[PDB]
Design a protein around this ligand. Structure first.
Ligand SMILES: Nc1ccn([C@@H]2O[C@H](COP(=O)(O)OP(=O)(O)OP(=O)(O)O)C[C@H]2O)c(=O)n1
Ligand SMILES: C/C1=C/C(=O)O[C@@H]2C[C@@H](CC[C@H](C)/C=C\CC1)O[C@@](O)([C@@H]1CSC(=O)N1)C2
Ligand SMILES: Nc1ncnc2c1ncn2[C@@H]1O[C@H](COP(=O)(O)OP(=O)(O)O)[C@@H](O)[C@H]1O
Ligand SMILES: [Mn+2]
Ligand SMILES: [Mn+2]
Ligand SMILES: [Mn+2]
Lengths: 398, 354
């Protein structure tokens, strides 16, 4: 019943809790299949529940490494990226000056535009009735718009929705008080389509099988278009990489600094995920490398995480003989997503996966704020490695 | 002060720190003369002449081997070799003069504090928590059968088969011609190596599998080449690794890996044979094929006495067993008194390694 291996003891989950996730159920299903096909464990950082229908719609592009401004998780701008970061999630409000500069530079540099925020009736009804993120609408005297209120946890701010018709669609344009005067709300839009972008799917980590470890796992620093052209042989490049060698803008938008710290395996798996989601030509959800190689990682912002595992983990002794199944110890939803809620549970999850032959990539930044440094090379050693050393030291007399 | 572990493979070098459960660096054993080593030599293929310093498990080019070791220390591990004791691996049956030269280079060129030279197969057995058993180690340039009793290899019973992954990729390139496909270049060899690693498997019954592939497309697989052209692979999926059991497929008059394992056990004392048969360990990348342990179990069962208990141990990380073994060995406190120190080298010379 209990998972026991050396000093690691896990009790079977008593009463299974249901965790509300922002990732659409259909994307969870795709990732559960990618995990099985590729024989990898894929972890994705949180996505706010209210972003669900925006991602499900498949109408929006999402933010990459050139849009560092945070998305909002409250108000009528929930799921979008406000130009005024005081309307973004708590982490952006904590460093308002830095995140406002991010928002402005992304637009001023051409990697984004300042767009107006339009919401449909379905979205308004969802924010009012489903998530209770917006208070019921009321016609405000003179203004002509529908007043609604929203809280960020500390203060309640009023918002006003004006009925408009864009592309012949009837929508509600979001307005707010800027110096006591009505002003159109601005969100960060895509530099090509001009449409508001949503949050991305940030890979937390990718655990590959030990038998698959090789030169493709070397995490490499981003190279400039010139540094990369000098390092490669043109004839050996596929049509995809030959196009990047022939077009600097194409390399800089799909490769180089835009990926961050990545390995060749991850660049490929990022393509597989994007292709399996049906998200290509500007609408990709995965834009860069995993949080395990992110030097600016914020551990507090990494949970709840959704992990996708190969199907054998779900079998009667998927974690090993007498070790049980992953669902016994971790919350697995209907789509096969293992929901990891905190760093301690992530540490336990990684140890089980390491014991089942899947390799972790540890970020020292994951230990920030922890009572103990769980994510270190020594603490995460494979129990097969530790057990064989105990056996060999005993046999050889060392 | 951590000890270093360096597995000098005929195709790949695996390097890291003792006490770790995996190497930090895995790169190809190649030098591209203008010099480039590992990944950079492979990446700049078009402007370089590539050389493998470890032909068939034995170091043949010491100038190129120093470049590999330098690249390992300074570029890969980012360490000062003069600060870390270093465990190096060697192929079974490595000449005394060869390990003396690698000991001379470790101390005189890199100035290591201490160094130890371990047999690759022995380290693989240690990585499985064992000190007794027979190891089948099949890498890129050589295959070995090494019987071990209480931590020690039995040199008289060691078998060497000059046939490993590299030959299987060349054979796969050869038999792919029989479908109209042409793979002849070094770059094309790498595409075929990838096809081999992804789609090959060992058939339990070769003749019945050949007959099944001859009468249906059920065993066929598709593979997308870098340029997007999709090819179809059929019986080559199992005919390629079949060479390990039938070396006559590539013109070799040598016995297969199942015969050499049996022949190795038979050259050992009767009293330990039961312990070798029950602790057959597979290591190396060329033992990674699906079905190789079941096929080996069956082939050894047909050769061994009827009541002999046969066990094939093929760990999932068997591609790294040699490295893991070295890390386990060099991380043991009671091994810290087996390192050949720089003091002992200055006094005795390269002969100290024996
Ligand atoms: N190899 C990598 C991968 C990612 N990043 C870092 O990853 C972070 C991506 O976080 P965001 O997507 O900008 O923000 P979130 O916290 O995920 O929130 P939201 O998308 O909802 O705005 C910030 C960036 O510094 C990096 O530097 N290097
Ligand atoms: C990913 C990879 C694997 C490997 O095993 O690589 C090693 C080393 C490699 C060296 C040359 C090559 C162009 C460079 C890097 C390949 C590295 O040659 C190999 O591919 C050779 C030739 S084809 C084969 O099966 N073995 C094996
Ligand atoms: N999954 C696999 N299936 C078949 N062959 C494999 C697999 N993985 C690696 N190999 C082969 O194993 C060889 C490398 O293995 P390795 O034990 O590292 O050799 P060495 O130590 O001699 O360099 C290569 O020929 C490679 O193609
Ligand atoms: Mn994000
Ligand atoms: Mn991101
Ligand atoms: Mn080897």
């Amino acid at each position: 019943k209990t998972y026991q291996s050396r000093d690691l003891v896990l009790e079977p989950i008593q009463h299974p809790k249901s965790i509300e996730l922002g990732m659409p159920e259909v994307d969870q299903s795709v990732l559960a299949e990618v995990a099985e096909r590729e024989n990898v464990i894929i972890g994705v950082r949180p996505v706010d529940e209210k972003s669900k229908s925006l991602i499900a719609s498949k109408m929006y592009s999402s933010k990459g490494l050139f849009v560092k401004a945070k998305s909002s998780d409250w108000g009528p701008m929930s799921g979008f990226i406000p130009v005024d970061q005081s309307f973004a999630k708590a982490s952006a409000r904590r460093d308002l000056e830095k995140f406002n500069e991010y928002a402005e530079q992304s637009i001023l540099s051409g990697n984004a535009v300042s767009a107006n925020l339009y919401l449909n009736q379905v979205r308004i009804e969802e924010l009012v009735s489903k998530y209770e993120s917006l208070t019921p609408l009321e016609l405000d005297v003179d203004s002509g718009m529908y007043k609604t209120t929203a809280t960020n946890g500390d203060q309640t701010i009023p918002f006003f929705l004006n009925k408009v018709t864009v592309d012949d669609k009837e929508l509600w344009q979001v307005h707010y008080l800027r110096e006591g005067e009505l002003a159109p709300f601005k969100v960060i839009g895509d530099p090509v389509s001009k449409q508001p972008m949503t949050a991305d799917y940030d890979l937390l980590t990718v655990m590959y099988t030990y038998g698959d470890l090789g030169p493709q796992d070397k995490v490499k620093q981003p190279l400039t278009w010139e540094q990369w052209k000098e390092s490669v042989t043109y004839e050996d490049l596929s049509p995809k990489y030959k196009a990047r060698y022939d077009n600097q803008a194409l390399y800089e938008k799909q490769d180089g600094a835009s990926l961050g710290m990545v390995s060749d395996r991850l660049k490929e798996l990022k393509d597989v995920i994007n292709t399996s989601l049906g998200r290509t030509d500007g609408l990709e959800m995965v834009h860069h490398g995993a949080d395990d190689a992110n030097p600016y990682a914020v551990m507090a912002d990494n949970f709840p995480a959704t992990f996708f595992v190969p199907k054998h983990f779900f079998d009667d002794d998927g974690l090993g003989e007498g070790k049980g199944s992953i669902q016994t110890y971790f919350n697995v939803n209907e789509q096969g997503a293992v929901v990891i809620q905190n760093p301690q549970e992530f540490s336990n999850f990684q140890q089980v996966a390491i014991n089942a032959s899947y390799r972790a990539s540890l970020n020292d930044k994951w230990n920030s704020g922890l009572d103990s440094p769980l994510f270190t090379t020594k603490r995460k050693l494979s129990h097969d490695y530790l057990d064989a050393r105990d056996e060999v030291a005993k046999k050889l007399g060392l | 002060t951590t000890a270093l572990v360096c597995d000098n493979g005929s195709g790949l070098v695996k390097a890291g720190f003792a006490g770790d459960d995996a190497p930090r660096a895995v790169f190809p054993s190649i030098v591209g003369r203008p010099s480039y080593v590992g990944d950079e030599a492979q990446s700049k293929r078009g402007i370089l002449t590539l050389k493998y310093p470890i032909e068939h498990g034995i170091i043949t080019n010491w100038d190129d081997m120093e470049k590999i070791w330098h690249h390992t220390f300074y570029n890969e591990l980012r360490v000062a070799p003069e600060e870390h004791p270093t465990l190096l691996t060697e192929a079974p049956l490595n000449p005394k003069a060869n390990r003396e030269k690698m000991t001379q280079i470790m101390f005189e060129t890199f100035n290591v504090p201490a160094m130890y030279v371990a047999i690759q197969a022995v380290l693989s057995l240690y990585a499985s928590g064992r000190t007794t058993g027979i190891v089948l180690d099949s890498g890129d340039g050589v295959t070995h059968n090494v019987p071990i009793y209480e931590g020690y290899a039995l040199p008289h019973a060691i078998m060497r088969l000059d046939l490993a992954g590299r030959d299987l990729t060349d054979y796969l390139m050869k038999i792919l011609t029989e479908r109209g496909y042409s793979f002849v270049t070094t770059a094309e060899r790498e595409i075929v190596r990838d096809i081999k690693e992804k789609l090959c498997y060992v058939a339990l019954d070769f003749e019945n599998e050949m007959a099944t592939a001859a009468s249906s497309s059920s065993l066929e697989k598709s593979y997308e080449l870098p340029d997007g052209q999709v090819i179809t692979i059929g019986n080559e999926r199992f005919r390629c690794p079949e060479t390990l059991f039938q070396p006559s497929f590539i013109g070799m008059e040598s016995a297969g890996i199942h015969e050499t394992t049996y022949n190795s056990i038979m050259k050992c004392d009767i009293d330990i044979r039961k312990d070798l048969y029950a602790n057959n360990v597979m290591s190396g990348g060329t033992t990674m094929y699906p079905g190789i342990a079941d096929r080996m179990q069956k082939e050894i069962t047909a050769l061994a006495p009827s009541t002999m208990k046969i066990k094939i141990i093929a760990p999932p990380e068997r591609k790294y067993s040699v490295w893991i073994g070295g890390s386990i060995l060099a991380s043991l406190s009671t091994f810290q008194q087996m390192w050949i120190t720089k003091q002992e080298y200055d006094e005795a010379g390269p002969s100290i390694v024996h």
